Tab-separated table of C-alpha atoms and ligand atoms in Angstrom:
chain	number	residue	atom	x	y	z
A	1	UNK	CA	-9.320	16.031	18.986
A	2	UNK	CA	-5.518	16.590	19.501
A	3	UNK	CA	-5.036	13.250	17.599
A	4	UNK	CA	-7.713	13.970	14.936
A	5	UNK	CA	-6.468	17.586	14.357
A	6	UNK	CA	-2.923	16.191	13.793
A	7	UNK	CA	-4.243	13.427	11.407
A	8	UNK	CA	-6.295	16.119	9.490
A	9	UNK	CA	-3.277	18.503	9.172
A	10	UNK	CA	-0.892	15.707	7.996
A	11	UNK	CA	-3.504	14.382	5.467
A	12	UNK	CA	-4.191	17.949	4.189
A	13	UNK	CA	-0.406	18.348	3.511
A	14	UNK	CA	-0.108	14.872	1.832
A	15	UNK	CA	-3.300	15.253	-0.282
A	16	UNK	CA	-2.678	18.823	-1.567
A	17	UNK	CA	0.974	17.840	-2.397
A	18	UNK	CA	0.684	14.258	-3.787
A	19	UNK	CA	-3.042	13.470	-4.427
A	20	UNK	CA	-4.736	16.755	-5.446
A	21	UNK	CA	-8.453	16.441	-6.369
A	22	UNK	CA	-9.372	17.908	-9.823
A	23	UNK	CA	-12.881	19.166	-10.890
A	24	UNK	CA	-14.231	15.626	-11.640
A	25	UNK	CA	-13.330	14.385	-8.073
A	26	UNK	CA	-14.486	17.559	-6.211
A	27	UNK	CA	-17.762	17.707	-8.248
A	28	UNK	CA	-18.358	13.962	-7.495
A	29	UNK	CA	-18.215	14.736	-3.712
A	30	UNK	CA	-20.320	17.928	-4.121
A	31	UNK	CA	-22.982	15.976	-6.115
A	32	UNK	CA	-22.827	13.098	-3.525
A	33	UNK	CA	-23.309	15.550	-0.550
A	34	UNK	CA	-26.086	17.420	-2.495
A	35	UNK	CA	-27.926	14.072	-3.117
A	36	UNK	CA	-27.838	13.040	0.631
A	37	UNK	CA	-25.233	10.188	0.112
A	38	UNK	CA	-23.287	9.437	3.325
A	39	UNK	CA	-19.825	11.015	2.987
A	40	UNK	CA	-17.955	7.637	3.321
A	41	UNK	CA	-15.918	7.753	0.051
A	42	UNK	CA	-12.189	6.791	0.302
A	43	UNK	CA	-9.928	9.719	1.327
A	44	UNK	CA	-8.059	11.195	-1.677
A	45	UNK	CA	-4.623	9.772	-0.559
A	46	UNK	CA	-6.416	6.340	-0.371
A	47	UNK	CA	-7.919	6.859	-3.885
A	48	UNK	CA	-4.426	7.688	-5.183
A	49	UNK	CA	-3.118	4.463	-3.506
A	50	UNK	CA	-5.906	2.463	-5.288
A	51	UNK	CA	-4.957	4.125	-8.620
A	52	UNK	CA	-1.208	3.447	-8.066
A	53	UNK	CA	-1.852	-0.268	-7.154
A	54	UNK	CA	-3.922	-0.710	-10.376
A	55	UNK	CA	-1.143	1.050	-12.386
A	56	UNK	CA	1.690	-1.093	-10.824
A	57	UNK	CA	-0.316	-4.281	-11.502
A	58	UNK	CA	-0.955	-3.226	-15.171
A	59	UNK	CA	-4.732	-3.505	-14.542
A	60	UNK	CA	-6.920	-3.487	-17.720
A	61	UNK	CA	-10.143	-4.842	-16.027
A	62	UNK	CA	-11.420	-3.733	-12.575
A	63	UNK	CA	-14.308	-4.940	-10.376
A	64	UNK	CA	-15.583	-2.663	-7.597
A	65	UNK	CA	-18.184	-3.741	-5.000
A	66	UNK	CA	-19.864	-0.628	-3.450
A	67	UNK	CA	-19.933	2.410	-5.812
A	68	UNK	CA	-21.616	5.121	-3.611
A	69	UNK	CA	-21.128	8.228	-5.872
A	70	UNK	CA	-18.241	6.736	-7.940
A	71	UNK	CA	-15.434	8.679	-6.168
A	72	UNK	CA	-13.278	5.505	-5.607
A	73	UNK	CA	-14.459	4.437	-9.095
A	74	UNK	CA	-12.966	7.606	-10.729
A	75	UNK	CA	-9.597	6.973	-8.936
A	76	UNK	CA	-9.498	3.323	-10.225
A	77	UNK	CA	-10.930	4.167	-13.688
A	78	UNK	CA	-8.096	6.701	-14.227
A	79	UNK	CA	-5.573	3.786	-14.043
A	80	UNK	CA	-7.212	2.073	-17.057
A	81	UNK	CA	-6.232	2.132	-20.757
A	82	UNK	CA	-8.770	3.481	-23.327
A	83	UNK	CA	-9.934	-0.132	-24.100
A	84	UNK	CA	-10.099	-1.055	-20.346
A	85	UNK	CA	-13.294	-2.060	-18.496
A	86	UNK	CA	-14.542	-1.258	-14.995
A	87	UNK	CA	-17.694	-2.857	-13.519
A	88	UNK	CA	-18.996	-1.386	-10.207
A	89	UNK	CA	-21.882	-2.842	-8.166
A	90	UNK	CA	-24.277	-0.667	-6.206
A	91	UNK	CA	-27.383	-1.726	-4.255
A	92	UNK	CA	-29.067	1.738	-4.161
A	93	UNK	CA	-30.478	2.866	-7.583
A	94	UNK	CA	-30.242	6.567	-6.446
A	95	UNK	CA	-26.539	6.098	-5.441
A	96	UNK	CA	-26.088	4.458	-8.904
A	97	UNK	CA	-27.708	7.523	-10.678
A	98	UNK	CA	-25.285	9.959	-8.905
A	99	UNK	CA	-22.274	7.654	-9.617
A	100	UNK	CA	-23.053	7.346	-13.396
A	101	UNK	CA	-23.345	11.163	-13.691
A	102	UNK	CA	-20.026	11.531	-11.771
A	103	UNK	CA	-18.323	8.901	-14.007
A	104	UNK	CA	-19.672	10.650	-17.198
A	105	UNK	CA	-18.262	14.003	-15.910
A	106	UNK	CA	-14.837	12.271	-15.476
A	107	UNK	CA	-15.074	10.908	-19.109
A	108	UNK	CA	-15.267	7.247	-17.827
A	109	UNK	CA	-18.833	6.532	-19.183
A	110	UNK	CA	-17.265	4.612	-22.167
A	111	UNK	CA	-15.193	2.062	-20.123
A	112	UNK	CA	-17.242	1.893	-16.826
A	113	UNK	CA	-20.710	0.443	-15.877
A	114	UNK	CA	-22.662	0.597	-12.559
A	115	UNK	CA	-24.813	-2.567	-12.129
A	116	UNK	CA	-27.697	-2.038	-9.685
A	117	UNK	CA	-28.809	-4.531	-7.044
A	118	UNK	CA	-27.353	-6.580	-4.178
A	119	UNK	CA	-23.809	-7.585	-5.279
A	120	UNK	CA	-24.512	-11.260	-4.242
A	121	UNK	CA	-27.207	-11.273	-7.021
A	122	UNK	CA	-25.127	-9.231	-9.547
A	123	UNK	CA	-21.863	-11.231	-9.152
A	124	UNK	CA	-23.388	-14.609	-10.249
A	125	UNK	CA	-25.095	-12.784	-13.202
A	126	UNK	CA	-21.675	-11.418	-14.334
A	127	UNK	CA	-20.129	-14.916	-13.854
A	128	UNK	CA	-22.883	-16.365	-16.184
A	129	UNK	CA	-21.672	-13.906	-18.900
A	130	UNK	CA	-18.280	-15.785	-18.807
A	131	UNK	CA	-16.171	-12.558	-18.734
A	132	UNK	CA	-12.349	-12.353	-19.142
A	133	UNK	CA	-10.860	-12.325	-15.581
A	134	UNK	CA	-10.471	-9.016	-13.653
A	135	UNK	CA	-7.039	-7.687	-12.609
A	136	UNK	CA	-8.142	-5.812	-9.433
A	137	UNK	CA	-11.207	-6.173	-7.172
A	138	UNK	CA	-12.024	-3.393	-4.652
A	139	UNK	CA	-14.422	-4.683	-1.941
A	140	UNK	CA	-16.074	-1.707	-0.246
A	141	UNK	CA	-19.778	-2.493	0.234
A	142	UNK	CA	-21.651	-4.232	3.106
A	143	UNK	CA	-18.694	-5.662	5.112
A	144	UNK	CA	-20.943	-8.449	6.550
A	145	UNK	CA	-20.737	-10.083	2.995
A	146	UNK	CA	-16.918	-9.561	2.664
A	147	UNK	CA	-16.138	-13.371	2.784
A	148	UNK	CA	-18.695	-14.037	-0.038
A	149	UNK	CA	-17.192	-11.150	-2.116
A	150	UNK	CA	-13.672	-12.639	-1.663
A	151	UNK	CA	-15.009	-16.074	-2.857
A	152	UNK	CA	-16.583	-14.317	-5.929
A	153	UNK	CA	-13.280	-12.416	-6.507
A	154	UNK	CA	-11.421	-15.800	-6.629
A	155	UNK	CA	-13.881	-17.012	-9.352
A	156	UNK	CA	-13.476	-13.784	-11.455
A	157	UNK	CA	-9.656	-13.223	-11.196
A	158	UNK	CA	-6.433	-14.965	-12.340
A	159	UNK	CA	-2.935	-15.496	-10.845
A	160	UNK	CA	-1.446	-12.021	-10.016
A	161	UNK	CA	-4.867	-10.245	-9.682
A	162	UNK	CA	-5.204	-7.982	-6.599
A	163	UNK	CA	-7.980	-7.845	-3.983
A	164	UNK	CA	-8.313	-4.699	-1.802
A	165	UNK	CA	-10.708	-4.699	1.176
A	166	UNK	CA	-11.541	-1.285	2.728
A	167	UNK	CA	-12.456	-0.601	6.422
A	168	UNK	CA	-10.946	-3.749	8.037
A	169	UNK	CA	-10.300	-2.148	11.500
A	170	UNK	CA	-13.902	-1.004	12.453
A	171	UNK	CA	-12.597	1.431	15.174
A	172	UNK	CA	-10.620	-1.483	16.748
A	173	UNK	CA	-13.700	-3.779	16.754
A	174	UNK	CA	-11.894	-6.274	14.417
A	175	UNK	CA	-10.050	-7.832	17.467
A	176	UNK	CA	-13.371	-8.822	19.207
A	177	UNK	CA	-13.675	-12.610	18.550
A	178	UNK	CA	-17.259	-12.569	19.984
A	179	UNK	CA	-18.659	-9.442	18.260
A	180	UNK	CA	-22.448	-8.867	17.875
A	181	UNK	CA	-21.649	-6.568	14.870
A	182	UNK	CA	-22.146	-8.387	11.512
A	183	UNK	CA	-19.659	-5.938	9.821
A	184	UNK	CA	-16.936	-7.166	12.310
A	185	UNK	CA	-17.970	-10.820	11.679
A	186	UNK	CA	-17.666	-10.384	7.870
A	187	UNK	CA	-14.361	-8.453	8.227
A	188	UNK	CA	-12.779	-11.202	10.476
A	189	UNK	CA	-14.172	-13.983	8.177
A	190	UNK	CA	-12.700	-12.297	5.051
A	191	UNK	CA	-9.218	-11.719	6.644
A	192	UNK	CA	-9.174	-15.397	7.900
A	193	UNK	CA	-10.251	-16.578	4.404
A	194	UNK	CA	-7.326	-14.634	2.801
A	195	UNK	CA	-4.977	-16.186	5.463
A	196	UNK	CA	-6.227	-19.824	5.034
A	197	UNK	CA	-6.748	-19.863	1.228
A	198	UNK	CA	-3.602	-21.304	-0.439
A	199	UNK	CA	-4.270	-19.102	-3.585
A	200	UNK	CA	-4.245	-15.790	-1.524
A	201	UNK	CA	-1.338	-13.940	0.156
A	202	UNK	CA	-2.086	-10.639	1.901
A	203	UNK	CA	-1.396	-8.025	4.530
A	204	UNK	CA	-3.502	-5.507	6.453
A	205	UNK	CA	-2.527	-2.013	7.634
A	206	UNK	CA	-4.030	0.282	10.320
A	207	UNK	CA	-4.405	3.851	8.970
A	208	UNK	CA	-5.305	7.238	10.431
A	209	UNK	CA	-6.240	10.378	8.473
A	210	UNK	CA	-9.202	12.683	7.689
A	211	UNK	CA	-11.551	9.654	8.044
A	212	UNK	CA	-10.173	8.733	11.535
A	213	UNK	CA	-8.819	5.357	12.715
A	214	UNK	CA	-9.399	2.496	10.227
A	215	UNK	CA	-7.393	0.250	7.846
A	216	UNK	CA	-7.355	-1.786	4.604
A	217	UNK	CA	-6.274	-5.261	3.371
A	218	UNK	CA	-4.372	-6.011	0.123
A	219	UNK	CA	-4.186	-9.582	-1.230
A	220	UNK	CA	-2.653	-11.151	-4.409
A	221	UNK	CA	-4.021	-14.265	-6.181
A	222	UNK	CA	-1.018	-16.698	-6.296
A	223	UNK	CA	-0.161	-19.308	-8.954
B	1	UNK	CA	-2.353	3.750	26.917
B	2	UNK	CA	-5.531	2.302	25.469
B	3	UNK	CA	-4.677	3.454	21.896
B	4	UNK	CA	-1.277	1.686	21.782
B	5	UNK	CA	-2.733	-1.495	23.445
B	6	UNK	CA	-5.515	-1.571	20.777
B	7	UNK	CA	-2.993	-0.873	17.976
B	8	UNK	CA	-0.785	-3.775	19.333
B	9	UNK	CA	-3.836	-6.150	19.553
B	10	UNK	CA	-4.988	-5.299	15.974
B	11	UNK	CA	-1.416	-5.703	14.638
B	12	UNK	CA	-1.018	-9.052	16.517
B	13	UNK	CA	-4.270	-10.282	14.821
B	14	UNK	CA	-3.180	-9.010	11.347
B	15	UNK	CA	0.449	-10.300	11.772
B	16	UNK	CA	-0.472	-13.834	13.034
B	17	UNK	CA	-3.095	-14.158	10.202
B	18	UNK	CA	-1.542	-12.466	7.127
B	19	UNK	CA	2.167	-11.678	7.834
B	20	UNK	CA	3.527	-14.472	10.074
B	21	UNK	CA	7.310	-14.379	10.778
B	22	UNK	CA	9.043	-17.737	10.060
B	23	UNK	CA	12.145	-18.612	12.139
B	24	UNK	CA	14.524	-16.721	9.743
B	25	UNK	CA	12.612	-13.437	10.489
B	26	UNK	CA	12.210	-14.134	14.264
B	27	UNK	CA	15.947	-15.041	14.489
B	28	UNK	CA	16.918	-11.862	12.560
B	29	UNK	CA	15.114	-9.777	15.279
B	30	UNK	CA	16.555	-11.879	18.179
B	31	UNK	CA	20.128	-11.389	16.737
B	32	UNK	CA	19.516	-7.605	16.140
B	33	UNK	CA	18.319	-7.168	19.797
B	34	UNK	CA	21.279	-9.395	20.968
B	35	UNK	CA	23.879	-7.183	19.205
B	36	UNK	CA	22.149	-4.039	20.632
B	37	UNK	CA	20.783	-2.632	17.287
B	38	UNK	CA	17.835	-0.242	17.860
B	39	UNK	CA	14.492	-2.092	17.432
B	40	UNK	CA	13.379	0.160	14.496
B	41	UNK	CA	12.933	-2.579	11.821
B	42	UNK	CA	9.656	-2.391	9.786
B	43	UNK	CA	6.663	-4.070	11.519
B	44	UNK	CA	5.910	-7.541	10.056
B	45	UNK	CA	2.689	-6.352	8.283
B	46	UNK	CA	4.765	-3.503	6.690
B	47	UNK	CA	7.463	-6.066	5.708
B	48	UNK	CA	4.705	-8.188	4.065
B	49	UNK	CA	3.442	-5.051	2.215
B	50	UNK	CA	7.017	-4.511	0.856
B	51	UNK	CA	7.154	-8.191	-0.220
B	52	UNK	CA	3.701	-7.915	-1.888
B	53	UNK	CA	4.664	-4.666	-3.731
B	54	UNK	CA	7.886	-6.359	-4.977
B	55	UNK	CA	5.808	-9.418	-6.144
B	56	UNK	CA	3.124	-7.197	-7.842
B	57	UNK	CA	6.038	-5.413	-9.618
B	58	UNK	CA	7.624	-8.809	-10.605
B	59	UNK	CA	10.796	-7.190	-9.193
B	60	UNK	CA	14.092	-8.860	-10.075
B	61	UNK	CA	16.439	-6.094	-8.778
B	62	UNK	CA	15.887	-4.192	-5.490
B	63	UNK	CA	17.845	-1.262	-3.991
B	64	UNK	CA	17.561	-0.687	-0.231
B	65	UNK	CA	19.010	2.325	1.611
B	66	UNK	CA	19.263	1.535	5.381
B	67	UNK	CA	19.767	-2.198	6.200
B	68	UNK	CA	19.937	-2.244	10.068
B	69	UNK	CA	19.815	-6.072	10.740
B	70	UNK	CA	18.335	-7.006	7.321
B	71	UNK	CA	14.732	-7.592	8.544
B	72	UNK	CA	13.103	-5.485	5.724
B	73	UNK	CA	15.844	-6.952	3.407
B	74	UNK	CA	14.566	-10.530	4.052
B	75	UNK	CA	10.904	-9.545	3.298
B	76	UNK	CA	12.066	-7.870	0.020
B	77	UNK	CA	14.661	-10.581	-0.892
B	78	UNK	CA	11.986	-13.314	-0.708
B	79	UNK	CA	10.243	-11.737	-3.790
B	80	UNK	CA	13.431	-12.183	-5.921
B	81	UNK	CA	14.305	-14.865	-8.520
B	82	UNK	CA	17.526	-16.974	-8.442
B	83	UNK	CA	19.127	-14.429	-10.930
B	84	UNK	CA	17.796	-11.432	-8.913
B	85	UNK	CA	19.837	-8.983	-6.858
B	86	UNK	CA	19.214	-6.914	-3.721
B	87	UNK	CA	21.844	-4.266	-2.969
B	88	UNK	CA	21.422	-2.710	0.512
B	89	UNK	CA	23.435	0.216	1.961
B	90	UNK	CA	24.311	0.434	5.679
B	91	UNK	CA	26.380	3.143	7.423
B	92	UNK	CA	27.373	1.030	10.488
B	93	UNK	CA	29.851	-1.903	9.888
B	94	UNK	CA	28.427	-3.743	12.951
B	95	UNK	CA	24.818	-3.388	11.597
B	96	UNK	CA	26.135	-4.728	8.265
B	97	UNK	CA	27.745	-7.834	9.941
B	98	UNK	CA	24.455	-8.679	11.758
B	99	UNK	CA	22.455	-8.190	8.503
B	100	UNK	CA	24.804	-10.423	6.448
B	101	UNK	CA	24.472	-13.274	9.013
B	102	UNK	CA	20.657	-12.789	9.095
B	103	UNK	CA	20.404	-12.801	5.235
B	104	UNK	CA	22.663	-15.947	5.035
B	105	UNK	CA	20.327	-17.662	7.570
B	106	UNK	CA	17.338	-16.805	5.271
B	107	UNK	CA	19.188	-18.351	2.222
B	108	UNK	CA	19.611	-14.874	0.544
B	109	UNK	CA	23.470	-14.645	0.701
B	110	UNK	CA	23.693	-15.584	-3.028
B	111	UNK	CA	21.471	-12.711	-4.343
B	112	UNK	CA	22.051	-9.943	-1.731
B	113	UNK	CA	24.893	-7.527	-0.868
B	114	UNK	CA	25.316	-5.094	2.038
B	115	UNK	CA	27.705	-2.221	1.118
B	116	UNK	CA	29.061	-0.359	4.158
B	117	UNK	CA	29.492	3.424	4.451
B	118	UNK	CA	27.386	6.578	4.005
B	119	UNK	CA	24.905	5.774	1.167
B	120	UNK	CA	25.685	9.132	-0.580
B	121	UNK	CA	29.353	7.889	-0.959
B	122	UNK	CA	28.417	4.252	-1.814
B	123	UNK	CA	25.674	5.111	-4.412
B	124	UNK	CA	28.031	7.001	-6.816
B	125	UNK	CA	30.421	3.975	-6.629
B	126	UNK	CA	27.484	1.666	-7.567
B	127	UNK	CA	26.563	4.022	-10.457
B	128	UNK	CA	30.266	3.776	-11.691
B	129	UNK	CA	29.610	-0.040	-12.226
B	130	UNK	CA	26.856	0.743	-14.875
B	131	UNK	CA	24.261	-1.413	-13.045
B	132	UNK	CA	21.068	-2.708	-14.692
B	133	UNK	CA	18.114	-0.579	-13.500
B	134	UNK	CA	16.315	-1.519	-10.219
B	135	UNK	CA	12.569	-2.419	-10.110
B	136	UNK	CA	11.933	-1.315	-6.485
B	137	UNK	CA	13.841	1.104	-4.219
B	138	UNK	CA	13.171	1.094	-0.446
B	139	UNK	CA	14.454	4.283	1.259
B	140	UNK	CA	14.790	3.822	5.041
B	141	UNK	CA	18.091	5.401	6.282
B	142	UNK	CA	18.887	8.983	7.488
B	143	UNK	CA	15.649	10.828	6.507
B	144	UNK	CA	17.579	14.161	6.199
B	145	UNK	CA	19.033	12.692	2.917
B	146	UNK	CA	15.669	11.393	1.541
B	147	UNK	CA	15.567	13.903	-1.421
B	148	UNK	CA	19.081	12.840	-2.533
B	149	UNK	CA	18.060	9.143	-2.204
B	150	UNK	CA	14.949	9.864	-4.382
B	151	UNK	CA	17.260	11.583	-6.990
B	152	UNK	CA	19.560	8.485	-6.904
B	153	UNK	CA	16.455	6.249	-7.297
B	154	UNK	CA	15.476	8.188	-10.482
B	155	UNK	CA	19.018	7.649	-11.921
B	156	UNK	CA	18.993	3.865	-11.043
B	157	UNK	CA	15.396	2.870	-12.122
B	158	UNK	CA	13.252	2.646	-15.267
B	159	UNK	CA	9.661	3.574	-16.170
B	160	UNK	CA	7.276	1.695	-13.856
B	161	UNK	CA	9.890	1.192	-11.087
B	162	UNK	CA	8.508	1.736	-7.535
B	163	UNK	CA	10.045	3.873	-4.729
B	164	UNK	CA	8.925	3.385	-1.116
B	165	UNK	CA	9.912	5.917	1.575
B	166	UNK	CA	9.472	4.878	5.240
B	167	UNK	CA	8.736	7.138	8.261
B	168	UNK	CA	7.283	10.195	6.438
B	169	UNK	CA	5.048	11.502	9.338
B	170	UNK	CA	7.810	12.456	11.919
B	171	UNK	CA	5.272	12.448	14.858
B	172	UNK	CA	3.221	14.992	12.853
B	173	UNK	CA	6.294	17.286	12.499
B	174	UNK	CA	6.172	16.870	8.651
B	175	UNK	CA	3.587	19.740	8.297
B	176	UNK	CA	5.911	22.395	9.907
B	177	UNK	CA	7.349	24.502	7.005
B	178	UNK	CA	9.813	26.108	9.491
B	179	UNK	CA	11.073	22.874	11.096
B	180	UNK	CA	14.501	22.772	12.821
B	181	UNK	CA	14.406	18.906	12.553
B	182	UNK	CA	16.644	17.690	9.640
B	183	UNK	CA	14.481	14.478	9.353
B	184	UNK	CA	11.382	16.661	8.791
B	185	UNK	CA	13.268	18.856	6.251
B	186	UNK	CA	14.485	15.809	4.276
B	187	UNK	CA	11.014	14.243	4.396
B	188	UNK	CA	9.303	17.472	3.141
B	189	UNK	CA	11.959	17.897	0.356
B	190	UNK	CA	11.547	14.252	-0.855
B	191	UNK	CA	7.706	14.545	-0.886
B	192	UNK	CA	7.884	17.870	-2.857
B	193	UNK	CA	10.387	16.209	-5.283
B	194	UNK	CA	7.869	13.338	-5.864
B	195	UNK	CA	5.070	15.950	-6.452
B	196	UNK	CA	7.068	18.261	-8.803
B	197	UNK	CA	9.039	15.638	-10.832
B	198	UNK	CA	7.231	14.753	-14.100
B	199	UNK	CA	8.731	11.198	-13.830
B	200	UNK	CA	7.140	10.633	-10.347
B	201	UNK	CA	3.586	10.063	-9.120
B	202	UNK	CA	2.894	9.103	-5.478
B	203	UNK	CA	0.833	9.059	-2.309
B	204	UNK	CA	1.464	8.935	1.425
B	205	UNK	CA	-0.536	7.131	4.150
B	206	UNK	CA	-0.557	7.694	7.941
B	207	UNK	CA	-0.283	4.365	9.833
B	208	UNK	CA	-0.617	3.107	13.400
B	209	UNK	CA	0.327	-0.289	14.851
B	210	UNK	CA	3.073	-1.894	16.965
B	211	UNK	CA	5.511	0.952	16.069
B	212	UNK	CA	2.943	3.677	16.998
B	213	UNK	CA	1.906	6.670	14.838
B	214	UNK	CA	3.908	7.006	11.560
B	215	UNK	CA	3.469	6.624	7.784
B	216	UNK	CA	5.021	5.874	4.393
B	217	UNK	CA	5.114	7.195	0.826
B	218	UNK	CA	4.890	5.150	-2.383
B	219	UNK	CA	5.933	6.644	-5.748
B	220	UNK	CA	5.838	5.146	-9.272
B	221	UNK	CA	8.370	6.104	-11.977
B	222	UNK	CA	6.508	7.415	-15.095
B	223	UNK	CA	7.773	7.300	-18.724
C	301	SAH	N1	-25.281	-5.780	-0.890
C	301	SAH	C1	-24.775	-4.697	-1.478
C	301	SAH	N2	-24.536	-4.744	-2.806
C	301	SAH	C2	-24.091	-3.637	-3.418
C	301	SAH	N3	-23.796	-2.450	-2.888
C	301	SAH	C3	-24.026	-2.442	-1.567
C	301	SAH	C4	-24.505	-3.490	-0.806
C	301	SAH	N4	-24.599	-3.110	0.527
C	301	SAH	C5	-24.210	-1.851	0.544
C	301	SAH	N5	-23.863	-1.385	-0.707
C	301	SAH	C6	-23.396	-0.057	-1.089
C	301	SAH	O1	-22.046	0.008	-0.726
C	301	SAH	C7	-21.665	1.394	-0.698
C	301	SAH	C8	-20.691	1.547	0.437
C	301	SAH	S1	-19.781	3.120	0.399
C	301	SAH	C9	-18.699	2.850	-1.014
C	301	SAH	C10	-17.624	3.945	-1.095
C	301	SAH	C11	-16.957	4.049	-2.464
C	301	SAH	N6	-16.273	2.758	-2.814
C	301	SAH	C12	-15.940	5.197	-2.434
C	301	SAH	O2	-14.894	4.987	-1.802
C	301	SAH	O3	-16.182	6.308	-3.010
C	301	SAH	C13	-22.972	2.200	-0.619
C	301	SAH	O4	-23.196	2.904	-1.845
C	301	SAH	C14	-24.039	1.128	-0.377
C	301	SAH	O5	-25.287	1.456	-0.959
C	302	SAH	N1	23.962	7.886	5.620
C	302	SAH	C1	23.578	6.618	5.809
C	302	SAH	N2	23.868	5.689	4.868
C	302	SAH	C2	23.496	4.415	5.078
C	302	SAH	N3	22.832	3.878	6.106
C	302	SAH	C3	22.538	4.832	7.004
C	302	SAH	C4	22.866	6.181	6.934
C	302	SAH	N4	22.386	6.854	8.049
C	302	SAH	C5	21.785	5.915	8.752
C	302	SAH	N5	21.889	4.666	8.193
C	302	SAH	C6	21.351	3.407	8.666
C	302	SAH	O1	19.983	3.370	8.359
C	302	SAH	C7	19.391	2.367	9.222
C	302	SAH	C8	18.020	2.861	9.621
C	302	SAH	S1	16.936	1.600	10.297
C	302	SAH	C9	16.672	0.516	8.846
C	302	SAH	C10	15.627	-0.543	9.165
C	302	SAH	C11	15.479	-1.629	8.103
C	302	SAH	N6	15.176	-1.067	6.734
C	302	SAH	C12	14.318	-2.528	8.534
C	302	SAH	O2	13.128	-2.151	8.398
C	302	SAH	O3	14.599	-3.630	9.026
C	302	SAH	C13	20.393	2.102	10.366
C	302	SAH	O4	20.977	0.800	10.295
C	302	SAH	C14	21.445	3.202	10.176
C	302	SAH	O5	22.734	2.774	10.549
C	303	MG	MG1	-14.978	2.333	2.456
C	304	MG	MG1	12.052	2.700	9.052
């Protein structure tokens, strides 16, 4: 609690100063909490980092795996130009209902879509539509399937596209080479895939904050 | 301490996988330790984040305030083209000598400079040369002077330039409005300048790892 109080106080200062939440973001959380969604959305300073990475990259087209109530989706969508496109995948139809409402409130209903079903079914469907490549992929769903989502990202991106993977530390569980936890297995497999793959270059960072001890990975698709 | 051991183990996993140090980086640290520089270089995974941000930017010109032994400078310099330029500022002449040898060993002598003296005296002399704008500014020197380094960054950049500020958590001290610590006061002033300036938009993230509890800020220059 001494640690967590300090991490809460520092994040409160950073968020209210640099990454303030407007009505669309606060109402998205309220509507998520009201609808029984687990409160596992990115922290606002993390949302702002996602938005800034999309902006720096010049992202026009964004793929997100794991919508929840569209809180991360509103952060990323706000990086996009008026003719941009964001596709988000969500397994739970009721999560998807909340997220669409939250995206419409933010004025992102024109450039965003939530596709319902297991992302490993939805990704091949999107691929069959032969879309223009995506500039940024945010992988934040069932971490067991992280290595499959990275493989799909490689098929749906181009040189200079970004891949962000949330929750890569798992309370410190990521170092256990003999884990029984499938979310650790998928996390380790995905990080090792980024390392080995000659078309990916990445880093990972341990974070603390209002969500506690965790971390994220950032990778670029190389030429 | 269990926390630090876990943070070390996670960082060793992430570093070996995603941000491995080649001999030029290992030798830069060995030479810095040898000459008795403080071991306060960025952690390898933070160095790799700098390099990735510079590559995402397509940076050609980088400004660094606080060289030490040139470890961060090598991560950043590796993103640059043959016609690129990294100008780094270092108070201590001995630090500067180490850093120049370390940058020469990495093959960066041709595109890098280390200018000796207090940065707030050296920066106006750079400005007198009518330099081309910089694409990324890394601020990592005396944190008391952060707000003045952010003001210099604004004068030496263009729209879409990136500013990174290291060590913005100050052991949690950053939230004390009445701080007697000049490093806290400079950190708070630079973060408020990022918030208030219409040409700046940023975030800050608390980190753990091999260097313990800290954090960084990232700001984008807006039109
Ligand atoms: N196989 C799968 N395909 C698609 N979504 C999945 C999935 N497994 C889990 N999910 C969804 O992944 C989400 C994880 S929480 C996502 C948080 C969100 N990105 C934010 O930061 O605001 C949940 O909504 C869960 O229903
Ligand atoms: N006023 C000032 N102007 C320039 N350099 C300064 C300064 N005050 C402190 N410094 C330098 O700032 C450095 C801080 S440590 C820099 C670490 C380096 N960026 C890395 O990650 O590898 C020291 O070398 C110190 O001498
Ligand atoms: Mg998450
Ligand atoms: Mg530093």
